[PDB]
Amino acid sequence: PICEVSKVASHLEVNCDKRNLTALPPDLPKDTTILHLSENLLYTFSLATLMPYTRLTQLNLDRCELTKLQVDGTLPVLGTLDLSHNQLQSLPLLGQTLPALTVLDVSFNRLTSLPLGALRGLGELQELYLKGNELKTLPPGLLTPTPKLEKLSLANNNLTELPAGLLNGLENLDTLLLQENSLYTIPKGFFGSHLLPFAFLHGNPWLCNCEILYFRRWLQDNAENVYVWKQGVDVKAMTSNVASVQCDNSDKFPVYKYPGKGCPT
Numbered sequence: 001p002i003c004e005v006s007k008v009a010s011h012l013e014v015n016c017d018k019r020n021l022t023a024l025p026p027d028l029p030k031d032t033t034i035l036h037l038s039e040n041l042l043y044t045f046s047l048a049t050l051m052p053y054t055r056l057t058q059l060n061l062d063r064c065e066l067t068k069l070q071v072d073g074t075l076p077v078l079g080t081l082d083l084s085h086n087q088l089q090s091l092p093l094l095g096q097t098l099p100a101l102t103v104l105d106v107s108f109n110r111l112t113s114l115p116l117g118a119l120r121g122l123g124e125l126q127e128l129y130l131k132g133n134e135l136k137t138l139p140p141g142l143l144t145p146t147p148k149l150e151k152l153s154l155a156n157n158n159l160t161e162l163p164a165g166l167l168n169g170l171e172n173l174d175t176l177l178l179q180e181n182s183l184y185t186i187p188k189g190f191f192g193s194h195l196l197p198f199a200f201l202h203g204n205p206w207l208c209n210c211e212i213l214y215f216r217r218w219l220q221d222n223a224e225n226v227y228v229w230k231q232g233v234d235v236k237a238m239t240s241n242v243a244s245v246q247c248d249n250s251d252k253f254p255v256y257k258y259p260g261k262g263c264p265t
């Protein structure tokens with residue numbers, strides 16, 4: 001039986017996880033809508049070899065020792081692609097071969113930075129996950145190509161500072177995770193004017209000092225919008241905690257409680 005198939009109305013799912021595969025299995029019912037290839041041996045894979053599956057809509061290359069993934073044309077309806085927990089050291093330019101991609105997950109890899117026109121081409125993206133990588137900086141105009149982005153997570157990286165215009169235009173942005181990095185401040189106007197339902201900013205050496213001021217006021221207007229990331233706790237039991245954003249300024253003093261020792265308005 002090699003993999004295993006099922007049928008949920010349209011769908012014709014193919015599950016081939018934990019199977020020491022090394023390469024894509026032969027049979028694969030050409031008409032597969034959702035293929036699961038999680039936790040297998042691959043090291044290398046080419047979206048090209050999937051070209052035969054016109055209806056493939058979800059691909060999970062989740063945990064497959066991947067170190068390289070080359071992109072090539074076909075795969076016009078692929079909506080979600082998970083490259084979770086792997087080894088790629090460079091973000092693959094998927095924009096020219098995954099036009100329908102709406103959720104990309106390459107979190108927990110060896111990414112140290114993103115190419116220039118990285119997310120170019122995939123202007124249908126709604127969820128981007130890059131948690132667990134490195135990255136100290138982000139290419140300018142990173143999200144310009146993805147105007148309808150809703151969830152964005154750069155949690156647990158090494159971001160020192162981030163563009164003052166990163167979130168410009170994202171009018172559907174409802175979730176932003178920036179926790180566990182090493183950001184020291186927030187550019188004036190960063191959060192712009194869109195209401196952010198869920199923000200995670202704890203675990204940063206926030207250098208509160210007059211520049212943090214803009215961030216302070218923001219933290220005050222959105223105190224019930226900033227939470228803390230806990231293991232497997234569900235938002236059903238999550239509670240706000242604006243005081244989780246504190247200055248690493250040898251204190252554990254909540255920025256947002258920071259008066260701003262007489263500083264220029």
Ligand SMILES: *[C@@H]1O[C@H](CO)[C@@H](O)[C@H](O)[C@H]1NC(C)=O
Pocket residue numbers: 134157158
């Ligand atoms: C990111 O933080 C880690 C923490 O252990 C550190 O080892 C690493 O050098 C930092 N960024 C890089 C990879 O330069």
Ligand SMILES: *[C@H]1O[C@H](CO)[C@@H](O)[C@H](O)[C@H]1NC(C)=O
Pocket residue numbers: 018019020
């Ligand atoms: C794949 O190979 C590994 C290593 O020998 C083995 O433990 C595993 O059982 C094989 N796949 C399965 C789960 O049948």
Ligand SMILES: [Pt+2]
Pocket residue numbers: 051052074
């Ligand atoms: Pt083709």
Ligand SMILES: [Pt+2]
Pocket residue numbers: 229230233234235238
């Ligand atoms: Pt939560």
